[PDB]
Amino acid sequence: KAEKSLGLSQEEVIALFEKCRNKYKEGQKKYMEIDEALNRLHNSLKAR
Amino acid sequence: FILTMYGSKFIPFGPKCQVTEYFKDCILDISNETTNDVEISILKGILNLFSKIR
């Protein structure tokens, strides 16, 4: 009954959560790298 | 330091002074104009202006 209410198999949902967490972590790292690069480029552009 | 020193008897304004020429030579050596601190460009301009002053 819980599975039919959720629809997707719990193993699939937990694997999707794990991959989503990995994607969130890599996206956060990419966002931080892009933000740092943009800030460094902005400071370099102002200095130049 | 450069702003403080100039205008005195020891470091007077003038194109013929050797000290200003040496300072300009050093600033031109460090200056690259691609990835440089603003202070280097400001020093170059100020030294040129002081050299031009008679």
């Binding site: 937990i14 959560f17 969130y24 933000d35 102002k46 200095a47 | -």
Partner: protein, 49 residues
């Protein structure tokens, strides 16, 4: 997987370039007034002079 997920739930799930510096400047301001955020942003983002 359930016990691993329980430890994963313990881990936080789902810019701040100058937030700390701007916040600390705002807290120690000694001024009774508007103190617009633009002033704090321009003061805390010089990076040159």
């Amino acid at each position: 997987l359930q016990d691993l997920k329980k430890e994963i739930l313990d881990s936080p799930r789902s810019i701040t370039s100058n937030t700390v510096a701007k916040s600390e400047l705002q807290k120690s301001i000694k001024f009774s007034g508007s103190i617009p955020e633009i002033y704090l942003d321009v003061v805390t983002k010089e990076t040159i002079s």
